[PDB]
């Protein structure tokens, strides 16, 4: 009855560890009982996971649940591939992205590219779930499977970049909410670097490399140049996140000097430390 609060997920970690040290078939049943409740709640933004403490406790619960309780990945996929009720507030966007980060971490640590992509092909998701059209509605109020998965993650990079560089630190968001936007973007770009650098996700890497060369498909999707405009505006405020974006550009072979000559300040007042 209280499972939306991360202090109760700490108690489920305790309860699950104890049944895993006696009845292994109580551990499986309780793991199904918890997972069949939490995945619908992540899909509806009903979990209180808008902090690094709460997101870290939810990540830990997914390591402690019995692997069979998550094994047909369809309920993870049907919980991840969803829109929020709105994007007009900061809180709803953060509850939505936090729930995606939790499930993305399960897919890349407890499943495989073959299992995930073959289920994404069968379940009939599409790239257009969070097109710029959908995003623009929800900000006012209300295919190959690797192409769907890659486009979904790269649309989230756009949403986080637009919010980090356009919201204001007393009007629209608090310093704690601004901190968690940066911690979510940092977590997303580390997931993308793991996916591209590990060699375990070769079809998603090929698809993402093809997407970064694509146009916006009639303005359905963020162009690489629109993402780079936002990232260039962060050089003065968030150098650590911009260096993760530089690392992503190299993993997809974007070696265009129109980016690299700006960040490296290539030759054609004390200066700013974040630029250095």
């Amino acid at each position: 009855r209280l499972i939306q609060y991360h202090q109760v997920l700490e108690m489920f970690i305790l309860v699950l560890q104890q049944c895993h040290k006696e009845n292994e078939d109580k551990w499986k049943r309780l793991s199904r009982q918890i997972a069949d409740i939490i995945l619908p709640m992540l899909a509806k933004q009903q979990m209180h996971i808008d902090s690094h403490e709460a997101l870290g406790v939810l990540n830990t619960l997914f390591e402690i649940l019995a692997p069979s309780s998550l094994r047909p990945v369809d309920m993870l996929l049907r919980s991840m591939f969803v829109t929020p009720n709105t994007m007009a507030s900061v809180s709803t966007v953060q509850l939505w992205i936090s729930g995606i980060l939790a499930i993305l971490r399960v897919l890349i640590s407890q499943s495989t590219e073959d299992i995930v992509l073959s289920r994404i092909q069968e379940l009939s998701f599409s790239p257009y779930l969070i097109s710029c059209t959908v995003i623009n509605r929800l900000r006012d109020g209300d295919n190959l499977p690797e192409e769907t998965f890659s486009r979904f993650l790269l649309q989230l990079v756009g949403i986080l970049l637009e919010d980090i560089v356009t919201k204001q630190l007393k009007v629209e968001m608090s310093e704690q909410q601004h901190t968690f936007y940066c911690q979510e973007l940092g977590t997303l770009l580390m997931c993308l670097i793991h996916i591209f650098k590990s060699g375990m996700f070769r079809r998603i890497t090929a698809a993402a490399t093809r997407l970064f060369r694509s146009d916006g498909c009639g303005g359905s999707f963020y162009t690489l140049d629109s993402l780079n405009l936002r990232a260039r505006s962060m050089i003065t405020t968030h150098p650590a996140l911009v260096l993760l974006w530089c690392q992503i550009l190299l993993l997809v072979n974007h070696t265009d000097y129109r980016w690299w000559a700006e960040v490296q300040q290539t030759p054609k007042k004390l200066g700013m430390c974040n630029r250095e």
């Binding site: 560089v165 204001q168 630190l169 007393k170 009007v171 505006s233 003065t236 405020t237 700013m272 974040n274």
Partner: protein
């Protein structure tokens, strides 16, 4: 004659603390006659008898907090119930309020219903000194007993203090303004009671064109200024807070400098601690429309072309700081240095929310070119850094600090 009343009050004090047995024999009689004697010694004609009696109440209270405290609070309540001479009532009321957090939960509902008749009856008291003790007492009593009230109790006590917002005494007005807000703050239903008090306080001024008394305007603007710090996180609405803002701007144009000062102080609180929906409204383009003379067109708060803080910074600058003549400064005979220092502090707070409002021309439509050869910017208010008054000069330095910080953060260092 004189020393006898001193030695009597002191010898009963010594005996009360010396008794040591305290098993409720005759000591319950002795402590009663001691407490009533000290509350008479504390309104005696001779200053040394009063100065002694205060030590004897304080000594007996601290000597008996461990054991007989329920009786101390009851004997203090009896003197508040008498409604007697001013110092005898004060001497009971502040001590009762110090001891109020020590009441056990089972006795709070009893003490509250016994004190609603008292706090209302003593609000009707004309003495300025009884009112300064009441201003200190209500926050302390309500922080302990307010959860044991119900809405009909709270509204009776709010209406008793709201009736004093009309008073000629600034002290009676201050006691009423602080009491009403503390009564909301310590209620069960705080958000309901803030919105209810906003509806009464706006109810006293809404028509705006009507012949409202200067005294009532001063009492209501003061009550809003204590309330605003509590509204930043049924509850207060955006439009209900827009009314407070529009009203606050209107009273900056009153003929009485007391009303101008009270309006500028309310405006300073609004920009230092804005409620979220009000912040959104005042920084949004067309935000309100989506729901010592001015000398030209400065726009209106309702204009579609701009954010409301742009009109606000023009209105303050045109009313108090600038004449329309480039690099010339309003005389200190025309506008007081106190009103000037407040106007500079309001502009510095508006520029913290929306720094584009600093860069504006003072008028939307230019003045007569034959009288005014060149146009004036709001940024001429930096000339007050050379003004003779240290507070005006210091307020102008805080405007420089707030402008630099606001522009650097709004631009994300893309200056």
């Amino acid at each position: 004659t004189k020393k006898d009343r001193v030695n009597h009050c002191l010898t009963i004090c010594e005996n009360i603390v010396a008794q040591s047995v305290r098993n409720s024999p005759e000591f319950q009689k002795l402590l009663g006659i001691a407490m009533e004697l000290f509350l008479l010694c504390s309104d005696d004609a001779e200053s040394d008898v009063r100065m002694v009696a205060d030590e004897c109440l304080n000594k007996v209270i601290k000597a008996l907090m461990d054991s007989n405290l329920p009786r101390l609070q009851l004997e203090l309540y009896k003197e508040i119930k008498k409604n007697g001479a001013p110092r005898s009532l004060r001497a009971a009321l502040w001590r009762f309020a110090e001891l109020a957090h020590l009441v056990r939960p089972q006795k709070c509902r009893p003490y509250l219903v016994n004190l609603l008749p008292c706090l209302t009856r003593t609000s009707k008291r004309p003495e300025e000194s009884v009112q300064e003790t009441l201003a200190a007492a209500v926050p302390k009593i309500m922080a302990s007993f307010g959860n044991f009230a119900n809405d009909n109790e709270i509204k009776v006590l709010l209406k008793a203090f709201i009736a004093n917002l009309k008073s000629s005494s600034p002290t009676i007005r201050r006691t009423a303004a602080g009491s009403a807000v503390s009564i909301c703050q310590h209620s069960r239903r705080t958000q309901y009671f803030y919105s209810w008090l906003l509806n009464v306080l706006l109810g006293l001024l809404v028509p705006v064109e009507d012949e409202h008394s200067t005294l009532l305007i001063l009492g209501v603007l003061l009550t809003l200024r204590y309330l605003v710090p509590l509204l930043q996180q049924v509850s207060p609405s955006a439009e209900q807070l827009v009314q407070v803002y529009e009203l606050t701007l209107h009273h900056t144009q009153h003929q009485d400098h007391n009303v101008v000062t009270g309006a500028l102080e309310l405006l300073q609180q609004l920009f230092r601690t804005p409620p979220p929906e009000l912040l959104q409204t005042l920084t949004a383009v067309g935000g309100i429309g989506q729901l010592c003379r001015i000398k030209g067109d400065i726009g209106q708060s309702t204009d579609d072309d701009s954010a409301p803080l742009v009109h606000c910074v023009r209105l303050l600058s045109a009313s108090f700081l600038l004449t329309g003549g480039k690099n010339v400064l309003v005389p200190d005979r025309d506008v007081r240095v106190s009103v000037k220092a407040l106007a500079l502090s309001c502009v510095g707070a508006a520029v913290a929310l929306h720094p584009e409002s600093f860069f504006s021309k003072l008028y939307k439509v230019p003045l007569d070119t034959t009288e005014y050869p060149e146009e004036q910017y709001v940024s001429d208010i930096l000339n007050y850094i050379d003004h003779g008054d240290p507070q005006v000069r210091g307020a102008t330095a805080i405007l420089c600090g707030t402008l630099i910080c606001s522009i650097l953060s709004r631009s994300r260092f893309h200056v």
